[PDB]
Design a protein around this ligand. Sequence first.
Ligand SMILES: O=P(O)(O)[C@H](O)c1ccc(-c2cccc([C@@H](O)c3ccc(Cl)c(Cl)c3)c2)cc1
Length: 287
Amino acid sequence: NLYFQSMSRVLQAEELHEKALDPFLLQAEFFEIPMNFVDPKEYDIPGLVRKNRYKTILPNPHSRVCLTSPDPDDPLSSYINANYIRGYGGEEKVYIATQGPIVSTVADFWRMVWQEHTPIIVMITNIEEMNEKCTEYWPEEQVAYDGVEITVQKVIHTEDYRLRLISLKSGTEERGLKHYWFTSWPDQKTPDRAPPLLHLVREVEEAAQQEGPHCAPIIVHCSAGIGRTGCFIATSICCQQLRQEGVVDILKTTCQLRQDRGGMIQTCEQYQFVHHVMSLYEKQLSH
Ligand SMILES: O=P(O)(O)[C@H](O)c1ccc(-c2cccc([C@@H](O)c3ccc(Cl)c(Cl)c3)c2)cc1
């Protein structure tokens, strides 16, 4: 309740099932959630226009990811359109929500990856949306940006994603990175389109567990880094909530998301989709 009054609607199984199929209650609830967008005039940085895909979708200042290398005192060099996102139970920095890199922000995105020790990237962009919704920021094989050698070591093709196993080398230190490019994001967010997003959420949460204690932030991106990104993150949080608590609170999870980054879960169709995803998971867990 720091940036706005949070809301909550704790759903047990039966109500969750019905709620996902009630678009009139969904839209009534959704359009009461504050967007918590940033006034664009909050950022008065010469050259900032080149860093943002959309002039009105800006990172909230309190949770903004600051690029501290090579100059933390230069407002432009330290800027990236990204925010630290709290996970389940308010765990700090479980994710980073960011826009899909553009030509002028490819090297900045890798600076963020390196600064944050990011082990996993979740890219929610369809094949046909390249390169207008996301610039291809990974190399075909190898590339070096600001002293970091980025190498794509393997491309694992699945039905709903392309997984790239990447190496990051600077000086003597070498780190691994998992890049999950999800290619099945639906235009029509019907229940039959919920299984590929659920599989991705479950794959990524098992991969984040395999990193061991205090997993570094997981980077999630789509075009503006709010809509599809908000859905992925809300689904991931509620999946942990349902297993731990036996209930889901998409409403309170959406409020938690909007407090960290304005516009997280941009549309009502996305809001309803998260309910289709959680209702399905609940049925699957029941067995
Ligand atoms: O969620 P948003 O961003 O607010 C918006 O609703 C939206 C906008 C565009 C798409 C999209 C883009 C390219 C191809 C396909 C399309 O060919 C397609 C690709 C994969 C699947 Cl799974 C489907 Cl069902 C359809 C769809 C999807 C969702």
